[PDB]
Amino acid sequence: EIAALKXENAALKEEIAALKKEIAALXKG
Amino acid sequence: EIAALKXENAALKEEIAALKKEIAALXKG
Ligand SMILES: [Cu+2]
Ligand SMILES: [Cu+2]
Numbered sequence: 001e002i003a004a005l006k007x008e009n010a011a012l013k014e015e016i017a018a019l020k021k022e023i024a025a026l027x028k029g
Numbered sequence: 030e031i032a033a034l035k036x037e038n039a040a041l042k043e044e045i046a047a048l049k050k051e052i053a054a055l056x057k058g
Binding site for chain 1: 030031034035037038041042044045048049051052055
């Protein structure tokens with residue numbers, strides 16, 4: 001359980017970071 | 030444990046959505 005859930009957490013954080021970087025890109029141009 | 034972790038999951042998803050909407054905004058203008 002927790003294992004996969006923690007994975008689901010980790011994965012989600014990785015999505016977040018990506019988006020944030022994207023915005024920075026869009027913000028810088 | 031799992032409770033708060035699930036919360037940490039829920040919260041994170043809510044961050045994601047926000048970002049996505051933001052990008053859409055920036056994309057539409
Ligand atoms: Cu890894
Ligand atoms: Cu609620």
